[PDB]
Amino acid sequence: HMFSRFSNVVSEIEKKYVDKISISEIMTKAIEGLLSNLDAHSAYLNEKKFKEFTEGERGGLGITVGMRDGVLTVIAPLEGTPAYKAGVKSGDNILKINNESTLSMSIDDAINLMRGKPKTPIQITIVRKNEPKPLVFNIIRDIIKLPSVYVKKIKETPYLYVRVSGFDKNVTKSVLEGLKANPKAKGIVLDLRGNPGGLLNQAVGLSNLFIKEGVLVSQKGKNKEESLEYKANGRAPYTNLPIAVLVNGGSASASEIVAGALQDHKRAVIIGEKTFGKGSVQMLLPVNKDEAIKITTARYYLPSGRTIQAKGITPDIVIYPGKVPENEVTPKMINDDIQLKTAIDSLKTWSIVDEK
Amino acid sequence: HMFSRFSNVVSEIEKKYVDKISISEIMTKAIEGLLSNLDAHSAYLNEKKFKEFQARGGLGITVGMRDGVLTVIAPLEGTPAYKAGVKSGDNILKINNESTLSMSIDDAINLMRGKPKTPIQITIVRKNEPKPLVFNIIRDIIKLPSVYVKKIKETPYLYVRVSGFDKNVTKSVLEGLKANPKAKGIVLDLRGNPGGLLNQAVGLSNLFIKEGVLVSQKGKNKEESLEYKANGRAPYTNLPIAVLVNGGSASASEIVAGALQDHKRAVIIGEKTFGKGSVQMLLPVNKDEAIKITTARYYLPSGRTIQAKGITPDIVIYPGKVPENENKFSLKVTPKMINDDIQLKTAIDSLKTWSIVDEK
Amino acid sequence: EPKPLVFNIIRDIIKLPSVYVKKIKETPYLYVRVSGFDKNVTKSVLEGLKANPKAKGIVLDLRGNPGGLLNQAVGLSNLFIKEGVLVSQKGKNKEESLEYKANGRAPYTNLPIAVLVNGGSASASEIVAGALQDHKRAV
């Protein structure tokens, strides 16, 4: 008799609502309301919209989305996508996708509406923090290769700049060989800004390149039988070399696990802005073949034990982007990127301390 | 197997969800989600928060939802909220420490209701503003002097304002009309009027409409079919009347505006109104829960509904000042104010041609 | 203006196309303009109205009309006034005191009409506008 309060209500809804309503509508709206109210990323695949999920190499817009403070936002436009080329920035609230209001629209619905074939156009209405009126974008989609990792030397300094815009399947291998290719290097600038995340095993593997021992990241929850804890093995190549990590509001998921692991192990300095805070994991629960729900089944926890979604990553050195004031391969860009100049400066003091 | 797909889902949630949740919370958050998705005004009174209906301090704004966001329909004239600078169409973004997204229409009112001395802050977004606006207002009792009539100087007409549909709107208008016998026309200003009780909109309309259906409550069940007529005789059935409406006119203000419009009893001047034609009722879900949902919708004498579209005026005029080719060369009871209000001056212009046409 | 304005202009012949009737789109009304009182104003206005059975109202633009001959002002006004005085020339000599009235043959005694005038309306245009205003025949 405990689930009676639901049967009690649909009786009143059938009779005293202004419109007569089919129970078919009652039930799709039944499952919608519970999923959406509990969790932002908890979305619903319908009685027919299951198989809807041989997709091939489809195209898309190239923005990763999440929901912060109940409203959908762009985590970061992936560098090199038509959305990145269009002028989208991190933290931008999506208000309408193709004149369709994202109000009470789940994260997955927004992703699917922007995904399709590379030639299809798409409109997005957005609200930015410092704009008088909402901004309208007319952009064409594209295929997403995403060249993740390249290592460059910071000229006139012994350091080198390594950028990871996303967690491809080849990030640990490409980063390691990029370091192996530079014996003369005395420091690293690891740019994880604008990286919306990726797969966990490449976040753990990249962090294992710098951490000898200790906890690295863990998935925990009420069921301790389903409580994964990743640690670092003793095979860490670069246990001494300086490293300065850069993060901003576009850093999410995997990039926060490695940045938080380095920060918590006091292995690196974190420069930039407070990150987005995407430390949730969802899971497909198969309601047979007709329906599937997505709900968060676990959360991510750092080597310090702190959770990610509630707070994100607070950097050790806060710096808003912009140009370096003056007085009148990475040269000149250091002046056009004040955050990069700070990460190099934090390495420069490390090289001084190591003079013992 | 009527409820088969709902019990089927919660089974996976109980076992494979990240957090432990009592079935009591699973159901309250289920039914809240059901209530909210069907109707904007459909809100929820809890297992304990029901029969908490006992009584008037507050902020003084009437709120509604049309496109998923809570907005101020119009700040009640003379309230401390009106004093703060609130305007129509402003999205309410934060009431206290709660982002108003997925906060029911009823819940937002409760946070603004309290004792008249307590202060309260509200975060608001306006249509043309770069960053959110912060308003710190103190609550107060709402007396709201609803109706006043003033003579329009240098014209034989008079200006009637109704800021809200008090229990005294038909009486105050009527006595105002008898108190100026030689008046030859009316400017009925319903702008910024977010509504009021239904019977005072019908009674005011009956003050000028001789015959015909006037407004209707209609739902899918025909057992709930109230039909309002002009069952009484109308004292002032001939004198001209020009009604002003804008984006802040809603419900009752639209009912009287549409009734006069549909019967060709008045000219409707201004902008499209807000479009709130629903009425709710307290429904007892046993003793634990109670729901507020729309029990009927309003239909005009023309048969058209009021919620989907509102009222489209006969003459559109956007607000501002009346132009003057030498308005800064001259620069160093309603006279001259007509020059500061282009909408009011147009309603006077339609009365002046009306009084000319009646010269037959 | 702060200083007097100087104009260098070349002259021309003056035909002056006085009357044309146009329909006001998305309304049942029509716009009739009279920039001057040609010898053909009553005839052209009447046939312009005769050409539009579906019309429910008139906008009579007399702005910028500096005047014209009296008989076409009286004739145009007679198109809308059934009876009553229409315009008069008076003075000390009552032997030379002309008074024009309207004959009963007025075609459009019901149809709405809104007249427009400005600082450029003079002479004839004021006789017809004043006649319609005084008879409460137009706005």
HEC secondary structure over A282-345? EEEEEECCCEEEEEEEEEEECCCCCECCCCCCCCCEECCCCCCCCCCCCCCHHHHCHHHHHHHH
Chains near C (3 or more Cβ pairs under 8 Å): B
* Choice among B276, B292, B341, B350 that is catalytic: B276
Residue with tokens 């305007």: B87
Q: Which residues contact B130 (CB under 8 A, 6 or more apart)?
A: A130, A131, A132
Q: Which two tokens stand for residue B26?
A: 């699973």
Helix (H) or strand (E) holding A348: helix A338-353
Closest by CA position to B279, among listed B18, B65, B42:
B42
Rounded Cα–Cα distance for residues A16 and B105 (Å): 19
Dihedral angle, C-alpha A88, A94, A99, A104, nearest 10 °: 160
Do residue B128 and residue A133 have CB atoms under 8 angstroms apart?
yes
Q: What span, in angstroms and rounded, lies between the C-alpha atoms of B176 and B183?
A: 11
Min Cα distance B355 → chain C (Å) is 10
Short-list A155, A144, A343, CA closest to A259: A343
User: Contact A33/B30 with Cβ under 8 angstroms?
Assistant: yes
Q: Is A247:A196 a contact under the CB 8 Å cutoff?
A: no
> CA B310: distance to chain centroid?
11
Q: Dihedral sign, CA of B158, B162, B165, B166?
A: negative
What is residue C5's DSSP assignment?
-
Q: Which of residues 75-134 of C touch B (CB under 8 A)?
A: 112, 114
- Among all residues of chain C, which has the CA nearest to that of B350? C139
Beta bridge partners of C88: C99
Residue reference for tokens 């004149």: A99
Residues in chain B closer than 8 A to A129 (CB atoms):
131
Please tell me whether residue A198 adopts helix, strand or coil conformation: strand
Whole-angstrom CA distances from B222 to A15, A20, B159, B216 are 11, 11, 40, 12
d(CA A69, CA A88): 20
Please give the positions of A annotated as active site: 253, 264, 278
Q: Is the dihedral of CA B254, B259, B265, B268 positive or negative?
A: positive
3-state secondary structure C68-135: ECHHHHHHHHHCCCCCCEEEECCCCCHHHCCEEECCCCCCCCCCCEEEECCCCCCCHHHHHHHHHHHC
Contacts with B295 from chain A: Cβ below 8 Å: 16-18
Question: What 3-state class would DSSP assign to B284?
Answer: strand
Hey, is A350 helix, strand or coil? helix
Judged by a CB distance cut-off of 8 A, whether residue A21 touches chain B is: yes
Q: How far is CA C99 from CA C80, C88, C126, in A?
A: 18, 4, 16
Cα–Cα nearest to A163, from A149, A146, A176, A179: A149
Touch test C–B: 3 Cβ pairs or more under 8 Å: yes
* Radius of gyration of chain A measured on its C-alpha atoms: 23
Compute the nearest-CA separation of B72 from chain A (Å): 18
The one-character DSSP state at B50 is: S
The minimum CA-CA distance between A187 and chain B, rounded to whole Å, is 40
Contact between residue B147 and residue B166 where contact means Cβ atoms under 8 Å apart:
yes
Give me A351's structure tokens: 């090289």
Contacts of B356 in chain C (CB under 8 A): 136, 139
- Residues contacting B18, CB < 8 A, separation 6+: A221, A222, A295, A296, A297, A298, A299
List the one residue out of A77, A198, A192, A58 whose CA is nearest residue A126: A77
Q: Which of residues 50-79 of A touch B (CB under 8 A)?
A: 69-71
Q: Is A1 on the interface with B (CB under 8 A)?
A: no
- Reported resolution, Å: 3.7
Report the chain B residue with the minimal C-alpha distance to residue A3: B27
Q: How far apart are CA A241 and CA A212, in angstroms?
A: 13
Phi-psi region of B157 (alpha: psi -120 to 50; beta: other; left: phi over 0): beta
Q: Cα(A41)–Cα(A280) distance, rounded to whole angstroms?
A: 9
Distance CA A194, CA A76 (A): 5
| Contacting residues of C for B351, CB less than 8 Å apart | none
- Buried/exposed code over B62-81 (b: 16+ C-beta within 10 A; e: otherwise): bbbbeeebbbbbbbbbbbbb
Q: Is B197 on the interface with A (CB under 8 A)?
A: no
Give the single-character DSSP code of A184.
T
Which residues have a Cβ under 8 Å from the Cβ of C135 and sit 6 or more positions away?
C81, C84
3 state SS of A256: helix
Residue A123, Cβ neighbours under 10 Å: how many?
13
Looking at this protein, which amino acid is placed at residue A347? L
User: Among the options B42, B104, B172, B251, which is catalytic?
Assistant: B251
Whether the Cβ atoms of residue A224 and residue A333 lie closer than 8 Å to each other:
no
The amino acid that residue B326 corresponds to is: E
Sign of CA dihedral B64, B68, B71, B73: negative
In angstroms, the Cα distances linking B66 to A282, B41, B91, B206 are 32, 10, 11, 30
For residue C135, give the chain B residue with the closest CA. B359
DSSP code of residue B196: B
Residue among A76, A82, A91, A81 at smallest CA distance from A126 = A91
Neighbours of B234 (CB within 10 A): 15
Cβ atoms of residues A265 and A214 within 8 Å:
yes
Strands, E assignment, A99-236:
121-127, 135-140, 149-153, 159-164, 187-191, 215-220, 229-231
Q: Which tokens in the block code for residue A155? A: 């000229």
Looking at the complex, does the CB of residue A7 fall below 8 Å from at least one CB of chain B?
yes
3-class DSSP assignment, residue B63:
strand
What is the rounded distance in angstroms from the CA atom of residue C124 to the CA atom of residue C70?
Answer: 6
The answer to whether A166 touches A330, Cβ cutoff 8 Å, is no
Selecting from A6, A17, A221 the residue whose C-beta is nearest the C-beta of B38 gives A17
Quote the strand ranges of chain A, DSSP E: 43-45, 63-68, 71-77, 93-97, 121-127, 135-140, 149-153, 159-164, 187-191, 215-220, 229-231, 243-247, 269-272, 280-287, 291-301, 317-318
Give me the half-sphere count of Cα atoms (radius 13 Å) on the Cβ side of residue B337: 9
Packed helices B198-206 and B252-262: angle between N→C axes, nearest 10 degrees = 30
What DSSP character marks residue A78?
P
* Chain C, nearest residue to B314 by Cα: C27
**How far is it, in rounded angstroms, from Cα A111 to Cα B154?**
63
What order do you get walking across the sheet with A63-68 strand by strand? A63-68, A71-77, A93-97, A121-127, A135-140
Identify the residue whose tokens are 């690293």: A188
Query: Which residues, numbered 314 to 353 in chain B, qualify as contacts with chain C under a Cβ-Cβ cut-off of 8 Å?
Result: 352-353
Backbone angles phi, psi at A125, to 5 degrees: -105, 135
Question: Any idea what the Cα angle at residue B37 is, between residues B32 and B41, rounded to 5°?
Answer: 80
Per the entry, the structure determination technique was X-ray
Chains A and C touch (3+ CB pairs under 8 A): no
The conformational region for residue B5 under phi > 0 = left, psi -120 to 50 = alpha, else beta, is: alpha
Interface test with A, best of B5, B10, B11, B17 (most A CBs within 10 A): B17
Report the candidate in A110, A26, A48 with the shortest Cα–Cα distance to residue A288: A48
Show residues of chain C in contact with B359, CB under 8 Å. Answer: 136
